Amino acid sequence: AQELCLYLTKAASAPYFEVVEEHEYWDQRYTIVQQQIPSFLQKMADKILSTGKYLNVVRECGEIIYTLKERAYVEQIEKAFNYASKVLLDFLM
Amino acid sequence: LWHDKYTLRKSMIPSFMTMDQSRKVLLIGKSINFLHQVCHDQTENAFQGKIDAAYFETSKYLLDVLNKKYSLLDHMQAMRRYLL
């Protein structure tokens, strides 16, 4: 029943990992919801929100798997946030 | 993360592991648990050889990440020049 509950969460997470709530001057656009935090990404609750936020101020202008005691996904997020800024910061200089 | 959060349970040690071997696992586990969180980094007779193989590699790597990414030695010398 640990192979099963890994088959569900592997499929019940593809929609989430293909898109933090948005709104409609820029600190009220996207804001963290505190309840719905996985409590194993709580360490990086600020780099996720900061990673996509930089992608939108440029867009409107013009794989992850869960493992225990292994942080292959915690490292995978830092490898994209370290690029999310290098495209926007360079976009303003 | 070294002084506390790890306790050698004297009661649940199997008889087929000597009391000294039980302090080399509590030290290899602690060496890897501490290497991830604080250091911010991610990676019979054959049984006795496995513990020592996991010891002479993990600890030797803990110093490398603690001398190149933090220069633990370069502070001991610098803490003598000024503070002493």
Quick one: resolution in A?
Answer: 7.7
Tell me the C-alpha distance between A32 and B3, whole Å.
35
- Cα–Cα distance between A73 and A10 in angstroms, integer? 14
Strand, helix or coil for residue B70: coil
Which residues in chain B have Cβ-Cβ distances shorter than 8 Å to A75? 42
- How would DSSP label each residue in A11-79? HSSTTGGG--EE----TTTEE--SSS--SSSGGGHHHHHHHHHHHHHHHTT------SS--TTHHHHHH
Chosen for mutation from A71, A73, A78 (greatest number of chain B CBs closer than 10 Å) is A71
Question: Which residues of chain A make contact with B42, given a CB cutoff of 8 A?
Answer: 71-72, 74-75
- Return the axis-axis angle of helices B46-68 and B72-81, rounded to nearest 10°: 50
Residue A21 sits at φ, ψ, to 5 deg, of -115, 150
Query: In b/e form, how buried is each residue of A29-60, taking b as 16+ CB within 10 angstroms?
Result: eeeeeeeeeeeeeeebeebbeebbbbeeeeee
Torsion, Cα B15 B17 B19 B24, to 10 degrees, reads: -150
Residues of B in Cβ contact (< 8 Å) with A74 = 42
Does residue A56 contact residue A23 with C-beta atoms inside 8 Å? no
Determination technique for this entry: cryo-EM
| Cα–Cα distance for residue pair B11/A32, rounded to 1 Å | 46
From A75, which residue of chain B is nearest by alpha-carbon distance?
A: B42
Distance from CA of B42 to the nearest CA of A (A): 7
- For residue A58, give Cα distances in angstroms to A80, A85, A88: 16, 11, 7
